[PDB]
A paper describes a structure:
The Sdk1Ig1–5 structure showed that Ig5 extends laterally from the horseshoe with a 54° deviation from linearity with Ig4. This angle is maintained in both independent Ig1–5 chains observed in the crystal structure. (A) Surface view of the Sdk1Ig1–5 structure showing the back-to-back horseshoe-mediated dimer observed in the crystal structure. (G) Our data suggest Sdk dimerizes using the crystallographically-determined interface, both between molecules emanating from opposing cell surfaces (in trans)—mediating cell-cell interactions—and between molecules emanating from the same cell surface (in cis)—mediating Sdk clustering. These interactions are shown schematically, using the Sdk1Ig1–5 crystal structure to illustrate the dimer interaction.
Sdk1 and Sdk2 are single-pass transmembrane proteins, with extracellular regions composed of 6 N-terminal immunoglobulin (Ig) domains followed by 13 fibronectin type III (FNIII) domains, and a relatively short intracellular domain terminating in a Postsynaptic density/Discs Large/ZO-1 (PDZ) binding motif. Overall, our data suggest a model in which Sdks form cis dimers on isolated cell surfaces, which dissociate to form trans dimers through the same interface when contact is made to a cell surface expressing the cognate Sdk.
Residue numbers in the entry:
A (entry chain B), B (entry chain A): 1 to 475
The structure:
């Protein structure tokens, strides 16, 4: 054909991470009636101008190039916007070069946080004390946030700790300065410490279909030998998916049946102490999907009212965003564009400048989907659905001549007899000659009203005339 | 820190396509008792030897360097094999440099296949005829396989066609040679043509969780205006997800409820011709998951029988392969290693050589998963559960001296009185002096049997002796 609006051949894939210093080539593959132009956008900011270059090449990736990219295609018809593509860049910074200090009273839990370091993705850490690798045991844990946890600390736990971090994507590794941990011997060598949850499980929301999800719970008590950390769901202790001395519970292939509350509980076996409990909540995000899409192309008559359907579902409920030619309707500030609460678009009076691509985006916390349509608004020249015919009407009785025309917008109809005008939209005021929808009615009719009449229906595009002779018979 | 078998901190992620000439960094991030060593494998072939370097770096990635990579971690305890990672390289070759010719009779469908070109991934195409971009219409379609299909060809459709292919990953573009198409005018301009399916929909198997899938169906008829191609499933025409003049049916978020058969049908609206039909079948692959995993560490006594659980479900049913220290049990040809049909491992008699990591892999047509355990086979020194006690027994009656021990392997028990050995595993013959399991029974007992007795239990590790006095009373 010779009048095709743009449409994409292929949409962006899943987000991806790339190494610093590598070459990146984004492509914008769309088809449509020429001349096609492409503009590139990063983070809702225009990067390039429109050109015949559908590619975008970064010869050496930096960390600042990371973000969300998307392409815009445009020809004479309209503009279409590509879905987001998430380009991440792998980097790892350096530790602040200064030692730190921390003090813990004897028996309490010692929690050493990973010293600040910017890294993408999260680095894998290996903790060290006096040159010896610290491997987790019943008394030592390494939380998911790379924090070291020493349970039931004694005087022998004092010393200088440090960590060695490795970024699993670029292989870079950095060694931190020291954290000097000191233990105060005030609590005593012999006592009993009620179980206390040091690291509680947190609420989690998982996109439906993910491989696995993990929960953690660290607790402190003394004697640590008798400390038991267990997971309850639906009032029953769980046994499957447990890791790291019962401190980690993993849901493999989580589904809607796994949502709800999980309860971490720590008890000191054989003690009169009340247990420690912490609640966590698993929910699942359903990425959006359309239940109502508009047809690909939509024809419209001017001055008409248009409704473009767009409804989408998801968990949580998706949000709809309307664009016209890659411009959000919000910034267009067109008062005639009203967005229905269902999500559909409502256009009051169609004007020729409303032609172009309309786009609907459904967004969740875990997805985004797009639909679009081409709106074609054209003018219709006036035409006669039924022309007036010659008629004979008895004196004193009413007479009606029909002159029905179709046009966009509605043609202005003017009934005139020879050189004088009898009725119009502006003028329907003399001798009870009435203009009704589609025609003229004279009531009553004298012989002085006899003669031939002409109906002039005019539009912004053209004008048309229809003649018909009326003869008045004697009473 | 000693006594900790290896285990990975992170496993490889989903496959990604990389550009030619980019830097590639694979990491083998595992923790465990030092000294740790690492080896690298590509396609069942070692790349590196064992060393203290956990990284593998390709400064300039080439097409030939594509393949499957994995690392093996090893310390004094055993060896552990990482999940394979798929390294794909984006490339785009050229077309075979020669023109081709094709002929179609006026009214038939003309199917032009994309000329041969090797490219990863599959290139997007734009079709041209005499320097004009061919845009799909009701009469012209571009298949999912980049084929151009012209329905109801006329003499005005003859000419030289060519395609321009673009690789969406690296942006390269190549232009094919010419297909000189001629249209024979034998059948005639004035006639009707029955709907005939040209491009049939293909069977599709899709891994569960994929975004979308699409069947295509292209049919030819004349007049092409009256040709309607629609999709029926379960005897009902589908209205959701129709694309490109009804020729494309797209299942969005395909789940188990979407599997089965789909039927394409093409009719000439208002004709006495029978409709044309074509069946297609959609199935869904469920990646493997474990339903039974072994414990992280398993302690075992020598000469005993061991069973290691490994079950895994999925669609299709997964295949399970076993390894011992990164060596497949099939290659080991060990007769004491029997693989259960449920997937479990069965070890007949535990020998100290059986110590080390065992690793179960579950793989299907759409995934692979890993579980492992460390088997520690040790010897247990003999220890008395109950030593012999002083006893007084009436002459003629039976008597029992109890000497029960625990050890691995089973301690050989030798019952001796003074310098003479009354009973042993080798000798249990004399005077109905019988060796009960863990004890000595004299039946009957004469006055000559009085005195104190000693029990000698010995394994390969050590030997222990225990004595007790026996006094016989007169009848
Ligand atoms: C473009 O937007 C992305 C996403 O909002 C930004 O990426 C974030 O960067 C900040 C700091 O650099 C991090 O704390 C976030 O974790 C990143 N991701 C997200 C999802 O927020 C990126 O920085 C933006 N680029 C520019 C130039 O503003
Ligand atoms: C490693 O093996 C893989 C497959 O076992 C090879 O990749 C295949 O190569 C053949 C022919 O070169 C292609 O037809 C397949 O499409 C490839 N499959 C892929 C890429 O998944 C690979 O070439 C081997 N490695 C090396 C270095 O040759
Ligand atoms: C954790 O969530 C509780 C309930 O909130 C809802 O349910 C869980 C599954 C979450 O997914 C959350 O997004 C939902 O809104 C709250 O009662 C509780 O306060 C939350 N805890 C927090 C926010 O720290
Ligand atoms: C299409 O498939 C039919 C059924 O086979 C099953 O479904 C397909 C989708 C595959 O997943 C296959 O592994 C399954 O066994 C076949 O009976 C039929 O012959 C196939 N037809 C063609 C043209 O391949
Ligand atoms: C990275 O690891 C190596 C291996 O031990 C080590 O020698 C080197 O010091 C580490 N780099 C840093 C910056 O600590
Ligand atoms: C209407 O009047 C104009 C002007 O006289 C004339 O050109 C036109 O032909 C008339 N319409 C028809 C249908 O004849
Ligand atoms: C094809 O590639 C050439 C150079 O590689 C480039 O100049 C041109 O713009 C590309 N596109 C077309 C349509 O030729
Ligand atoms: C065992 O018997 C011998 C001789 O019959 C005797 O000398 C010895 O004291 C006895 N053992 C004990 C522990 O009395
Ligand atoms: C008997 O046991 C003792 C004590 O365990 C040990 O010293 C001795 O070597 C054993 N054997 C003999 C023959 O005394």
């Amino acid at each position: 054909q010779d009048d095709v609006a743009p449409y994409f051949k292929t949409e962006p894939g899943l987000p991806q991470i790339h190494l610093e210093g590598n070459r990146l080539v984004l492509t914008c593959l769309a088809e449509g009636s020429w001349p096609l132009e492409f503009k590139w956008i990063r983070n809702d900011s225009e990067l390039t101008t429109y050109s015949s270059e559908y590619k975008y090449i970064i010869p050496s990736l930096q960390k600042l190039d990371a973000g969300f990219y998307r392409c815009v295609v445009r020809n004479r018809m309209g503009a279409l916007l590509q879905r987001k593509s998430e380009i991440q860049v792998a980097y790892m910074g350096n530790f602040m070069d200064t030692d730190q200090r921390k003090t813990v009273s004897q028996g309490h839990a010692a929690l050493l946080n990973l010293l600040p370091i910017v890294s993408c993705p999260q680095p894998q850490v290996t903790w060290f004390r006096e040159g010896h690798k610290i491997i987790p045991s019943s008394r030592i844990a390494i939380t998911l946030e790379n924090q070291l946890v020493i349970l039931a600390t004694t005087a022998s736990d004092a010393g200088a700790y440090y960590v060695q971090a490795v970024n699993e994507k670029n292989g870079e590794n950095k060694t931190s300065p020291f954290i000097h941990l000191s233990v105060a011997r005030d609590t005593g060598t012999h006592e009993a410490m009620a179980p206390i949850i040091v690291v509680a499980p947190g609420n989690r929301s998982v996109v439906a279909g993910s491989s696995e999800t993990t929960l953690e719970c660290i607790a402190n008590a003394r004697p640590v030998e008798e400390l038991s950390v267990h997971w309850k769901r639906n009032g029953v202790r769980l046994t499957s998916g447990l890791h790291s001395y019962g401190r980690r519970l993993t849901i493999t292939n989580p589904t809607s049946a796994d949502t709800g509350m999980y309860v971490c509980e720590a008890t000191l076996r054989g003690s009169t102490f009340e247990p420690a409990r912490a609640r966590a909540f698993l929910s699942i995000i359903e990425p959006p999907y359309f239940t109502a899409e508009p047809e690909s192309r939509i024809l419209g008559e001017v001055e008409e009212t248009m409704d473009i359907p767009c409804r989408a579902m998801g968990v949580p409920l998706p949000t709809l965003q309307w664009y016209k030619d890659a411009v959000p309707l919000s910034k267009l500030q067109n008062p005639r564009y009203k967005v229905l609460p269902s999500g559909g678009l409502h256009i009051q009076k169609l004007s020729p400048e409303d032609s172009g691509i309309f786009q609907c985006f459904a967004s969740n916390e875990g997805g985004e989907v797009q639909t679009h349509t081409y709106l074609d608004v054209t003018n219709i020249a006036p035409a006669f659905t039924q022309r007036p015919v010659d008629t004979t009407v008895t004196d004193g009785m009413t007479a009606v001549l029909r002159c029905e025309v179709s046009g966009a917008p509605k043609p202005a109809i003017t009934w005139k007899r020879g050189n004088h005008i009898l009725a119009s939209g502006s003028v329907r005021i003399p001798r009870f000659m009435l203009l009704e929808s589609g025609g003229l009615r004279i009531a009553p009719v004298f012989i002085q009203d006899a003669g031939n009449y002409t109906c002039y229906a005019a539009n912004t595009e053209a004008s048309v005339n229809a003649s018909a002779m009326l003869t008045v018979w004697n009473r």
